[PDB]
From Swiss-Prot:
<feature type="active site" description="Proton donor">
    <location>
        <position position="186"/>
    </location>
</feature>
<keyword id="KW-0808">Transferase</keyword>
<feature type="binding site">
    <location>
        <position position="186"/>
    </location>
    <ligand>
        <name>substrate</name>
    </ligand>
</feature>
<dbReference type="GO" id="GO:0009251">
    <property type="term" value="P:glucan catabolic process"/>
</dbReference>
<keyword id="KW-0130">Cell adhesion</keyword>
<keyword id="KW-0964">Secreted</keyword>
<keyword id="KW-0865">Zymogen</keyword>
<feature type="binding site">
    <location>
        <position position="23"/>
    </location>
    <ligand>
        <name>substrate</name>
    </ligand>
</feature>
<keyword id="KW-0165">Cleavage on pair of basic residues</keyword>
<dbReference type="GO" id="GO:1903561">
    <property type="term" value="C:extracellular vesicle"/>
</dbReference>
<protein>
    <recommendedName>
        <fullName>Glucan 1,3-beta-glucosidase</fullName>
        <ecNumber>2.4.1.-</ecNumber>
        <ecNumber>3.2.1.58</ecNumber>
    </recommendedName>
</protein>
<feature type="binding site">
    <location>
        <position position="256"/>
    </location>
    <ligand>
        <name>substrate</name>
    </ligand>
</feature>
<dbReference type="GO" id="GO:0009986">
    <property type="term" value="C:cell surface"/>
</dbReference>
<feature type="binding site">
    <location>
        <position position="249"/>
    </location>
    <ligand>
        <name>substrate</name>
    </ligand>
</feature>
<feature type="disulfide bond">
    <location>
        <begin position="294"/>
        <end position="320"/>
    </location>
</feature>
<dbReference type="GO" id="GO:0044011">
    <property type="term" value="P:single-species biofilm formation on inanimate substrate"/>
</dbReference>
<dbReference type="InterPro" id="IPR050386">
    <property type="entry name" value="Glycosyl_hydrolase_5"/>
</dbReference>
């Protein structure tokens, strides 16, 4: 259904839909604020569902699931010249741990989305975005500040969830739509046992192929250096249809934030050069237009922005308030953003393509493909260049 040698992925993530993220849908979290006090705001989906209870959580989420993304979005995506979506989903859509606060129902909408994809000639990855115990401690795993995916029976439960996903979506029924199943979003390499993570990836690869599925297996790079995965799941060992997912940002440290625009572009270009050297097919499955970490709650509920020296002992660089509304942006900031987007697009099209995070947000413009396109900052058509050939690829 896809030719990873000859085709380029031009896609968007459908984030904030089946896994809640406070910075993406702040309207669902803000009712818990007490004036300016954020101390009682639930920090993740786990705590949000727990605080509301099962009945209120399901009422509110059904409304969200039914309106956040609809068939109309899929038509707009196709109209904009995109060919692909990545769909994050948590483990709790399929299986609950004993005493999990989560509610279910996401699968009905996942299956509607697969039909909407088919109808609009859009291909899909399904991405297991949160594992039991958390694989990274990020709020977008479902459970912040916990790192227990490799503890207890949590890895085994994750494999059971993947087998369900494999039997449902890795078979003949969706072979014209599903071009990859991503085993686990962003396992936090530095705090995990890498040998056990490799064993988990291998078990997932083998279990899918044992079902008779030919669907590509997508592995996230676990924040390892370029080339780390070259010798893993290789054709020499009869392992095939494997894609590496690299994610790229320049906003989650003080050092990255303090770079001038020219150095931001140099780093983006180098992502392209380095990915070209790798031995697996590879796709940039997550990236954005952000040059700041100013979006409210990007770093988590009740955490501030490094950009204005309010988090992670970062020095003050600039005030976030002026950057929260795209209509208040300076001419210089608009230009820098367009340059940065174009450099990233050229770098990512130099290998398998790109998947922008995300299609939409309530009010965070750096992270919304819609908002950027409508304001002329994301190229439309996506091949248009105001700053051609910044990287000099050959
Ligand atoms: O050490 N690391 O491998 C690593 C990984 C992700 C890191 O950054 C993480 O990036 C994610 C996007 O990939 C964000 O969702 C998280 O909020 C952020 F903590 C950082 N960090 O905080 O600078 C370090
Ligand atoms: C990739 O990173 C973005 C930004 O931190 C998150 O919103 C996603 O859930 C994660 F997958």
């Amino acid at each position: 259904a896809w030719d990873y040698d000859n085709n380029v992925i031009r896609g968007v993530n459908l984030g904030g839909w089946f896994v809640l993220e406070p910075y993406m849908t702040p309207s669902l979290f803000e009712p818990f604020q007490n004036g300016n006090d954020q101390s009682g705001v639930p920090v993740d989906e786990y705590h949000w569902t727990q605080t509301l209870g099962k009945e209120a959580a399901l009422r509110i989420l059904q409304k969200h699931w039914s309106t956040w993304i609809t068939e109309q979005d899929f038509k707009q995506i196709s109209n904009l010249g995109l060919n692909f979506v990545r769909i994050p989903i948590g483990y709790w859509a399929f299986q609950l741990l004993d005493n999990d606060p989560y509610v279910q129902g996401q699968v009905q909408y996942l299956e509607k989305a697969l039909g909407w994809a088919r109808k609009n000639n859009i291909r899909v990855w399904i991405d297991l975005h949160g594992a039991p115990g958390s694989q990274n401690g990020f709020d977008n795993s479902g459970l912040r500040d916990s790192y227990n995916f490799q503890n207890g029976d949590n890895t085994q439960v994750t494999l059971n969830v993947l087998n369900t996903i494999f039997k449902k979506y890795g078979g003949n029924e969706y072979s014209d739509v599903v071009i990859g199943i991503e085993l686990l979003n962003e396992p936090l390499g530095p705090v995990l046992n890498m040998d056990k993570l490799k064993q988990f990836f291998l078990d997932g690869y083998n279990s899918l192929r044992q079902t008779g599925s030919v669907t590509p297996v997508i592995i996230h790079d676990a924040f390892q250096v370029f080339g780390y995965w070259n010798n893993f799941l290789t054709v020499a060992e009869g392992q095939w249809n494997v894609v590496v997912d690299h994610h790229h940002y320049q906003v989650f440290s003080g050092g990255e934030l303090s770079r001038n625009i020219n150095d931001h572009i140099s780093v983006a270009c180098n992502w392209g050069w380095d990915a070209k050297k790798e031995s697996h097919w590879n796709v940039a499955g997550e990236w954005s237009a952000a040059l700041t970490d100013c979006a409210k709650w990007l770093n988590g509920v009740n955490r501030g922005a490094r950009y204005e020296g309010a988090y992670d002992n970062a020095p003050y660089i600039g005030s976030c308030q002026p950057l929260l509304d795209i209509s208040q942006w300076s001419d210089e900031h608009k230009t820098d953003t367009r340059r940065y987007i174009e450099a990233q697009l050229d770098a990512f099209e130099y290998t398998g393509g790109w998947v922008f995070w995300s299609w939409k947000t309530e009010n965070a413009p750096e992270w919304s493909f819609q908002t950027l396109t409508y304001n002329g900052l994301f190229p439309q058509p996506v091949t248009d260049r105001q700053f051609p050939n910044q990287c000099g690829f050959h």
